[PDB]
Design an enzyme around this catalytic site. Structure first.
Site, PDB file in Angstrom:
ATOM      1  N   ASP B  25      -1.428  11.948  -5.432  1.00 55.56           N
ATOM      2  CA  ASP B  25      -2.054  12.057  -4.058  1.00 55.56           C
ATOM      3  C   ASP B  25      -2.861  10.900  -3.688  1.00 55.56           C
ATOM      4  OD1 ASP B  25      -3.396  13.447  -1.662  1.00 55.56           O
ATOM      5  OD2 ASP B  25      -4.010  15.214  -3.207  1.00 55.56           O
ATOM      6  N   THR B  26      -2.498  10.188  -2.592  1.00 58.24           N
ATOM      7  CA  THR B  26      -3.296   8.984  -2.127  1.00 58.24           C
ATOM      8  C   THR B  26      -4.382   9.713  -1.114  1.00 58.24           C
ATOM      9  OG1 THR B  26      -1.631   8.890  -0.195  1.00 58.24           O
ATOM     10  CG2 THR B  26      -1.111   7.592  -2.057  1.00 58.24           C
ATOM     11  N   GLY B  27      -4.611  10.795  -0.981  1.00 54.88           N
ATOM     12  CA  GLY B  27      -5.819  11.380  -0.186  1.00 54.88           C
ATOM     13  C   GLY B  27      -6.536  12.329  -1.060  1.00 54.88           C
TER      14      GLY B  27
END
Ligand SMILES: CCC(CC)NC(=O)C[C@@H](C(=O)NC[C@@H](O)[C@H](Cc1ccccc1)NC(=O)[C@@H](NC(=O)c1ccc2ccccc2n1)[C@@H](C)O)C(C)(C)C
Lengths: 99, 99
Positions: B25-27
């Protein structure tokens, strides 16, 4: 454009012409934005996070301009601390996670 | 490996030898996992998203084998509905977001 994840992957997109900062989120199935008026034509939707649920207003066929690219998708609207571009938009744009 | 984003980018990781399915997950600034006893010395913390926040146990220097690599990093434990590998881990594997 390639993003290292040292810092949050944040960009400027125009939703229906209004500029905003959004986090490109491979961990969000859906996109949610706060503080923009999208109109009267929506649907109440109820959404989940780590924290818990939230109710949103759901917009369809929204004109988005991000990263020199034009897309249309579902934007949800709501109390979100950071605005997020989920996998529905990311897919439409052609982005990918690499190793 | 490249992950198109059509489906959730999920993978099998071993956290201290225990296998686990995780979200890349980049967020996610933090890495958070449910159902593994990482043990005794941890630090009381919180983690939040959409909807709210939860109580976590922060462990440091955990051994993880994922994507054919070996890292050591901080992982929180708490009652998350999905296990998440955030940017702290992704940055260690050398993964990037591309277009
Ligand atoms: C069904 C609708 C969508 C809506 C996003 N929900 C999901 O797809 C569920 C899905 C999810 O919520 N994904 C989004 C997640 O990736 C969100 C995105 C995000 C970033 C920043 C602020 C808020 C929210 N991130 C997170 O939950 C991680 N949060 C953060 O990194 C983070 C950063 C700054 C913050 C500031 C104030 C309050 C909260 C803050 N949370 C957490 C693991 O440490 C699961 C539970 C599977 C991870």
């Amino acid at each position: 454009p390639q993003f290292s994840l040292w810092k949050r992957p944040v960009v400027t997109a125009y939703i229906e012409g209004q500029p905003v900062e959004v986090l490109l989120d491979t961990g969000a199935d859906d996109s949610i934005v706060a503080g923009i008026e999208l109109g009267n034509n929506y649907s109440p939707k109820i959404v989940g996070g780590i924290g818990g649920f939230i109710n949103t207003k759901e917009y369809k066929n929204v004109e988005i301009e991000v990263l020199n690219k034009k897309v249309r998708a579902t934007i949800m609207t709501g109390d979100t601390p950071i605005n997020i571009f989920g996998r529905n938009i990311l897919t439409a744009l052609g982005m990918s996670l690499n190793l």
